[PDB]
Amino acid sequence: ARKKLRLYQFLLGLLLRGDMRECVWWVEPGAGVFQFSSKHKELLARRWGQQKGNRKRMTYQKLARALRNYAKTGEIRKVKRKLTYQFDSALLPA
DNA sequence: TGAAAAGAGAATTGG
DNA sequence: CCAATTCTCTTTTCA
Numbered sequence: 001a002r003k004k005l006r007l008y009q010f011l012l013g014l015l016l017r018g019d020m021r022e023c024v025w026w027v028e029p030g031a032g033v034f035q036f037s038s039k040h041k042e043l044l045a046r047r048w049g050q051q052k053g054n055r056k057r058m059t060y061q062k063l064a065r066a067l068r069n070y071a072k073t074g075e076i077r078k079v080k081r082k083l084t085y086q087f088d089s090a091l092l093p094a
Numbered sequence: 095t096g097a098a099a100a101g102a103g104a105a106t107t108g109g
Numbered sequence: 110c111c112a113a114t115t116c117t118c119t120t121t122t123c124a
């Protein structure tokens with residue numbers, strides 16, 4: 001049984017390594033607050049779908065749909081700012 | 095002033 | 110049965 005990345009792991013990994021900075025970036029790195037690019041977010045979503053191996057092309061609408069489910073478990077919450085989210089502090093350094 | 099963004103229930107699916 | 114994936118409909122927001 002193989003393992004596949006979780007959405008919050010994929011996103012957090014992109015931010016820490018500095019990948020796809022034109023697609024997603026930190027807004028407040030100390031607070032774990034990050035924002036997606038209005039025009040270039042579809043590039044990131046489709047990259048998420050290729051790595052997962054999904055049947056359909058991944059879109060930001062479907063990626064955002066998955067992000068909202070994290071509200072039950074607290075990994076990521078939506079911030080009251082356009083395309084902006086916040087990792088829980090348990091997933092961040094000191 | 096419509097695309098964009100936000101939100102959502104629900105059946106589905108790989109593993 | 111987890112962790113999304115996919116599809117659908119709705120409304121507010123914004124550029």
Ligand SMILES: *O[C@H]1C[C@H](n2cnc3c(N)ncnc32)O[C@@H]1CO
Pocket residue numbers: 095
């Ligand atoms: O066709 C109507 C509505 C449209 N329009 C575009 N952007 C608008 C804003 N910000 N306020 C109001 N109406 C807006 O232009 C026409 C009215 O001038």
Ligand SMILES: *O[C@H]1C[C@H](n2cc(C)c(=O)[nH]c2=O)O[C@@H]1CO
Pocket residue numbers: 110
């Ligand atoms: O939660 C139930 C179903 C669940 N389950 C079902 C099936 C068909 C599967 O392949 N994996 C799996 O975890 O297990 C529980 C019953 O043992």
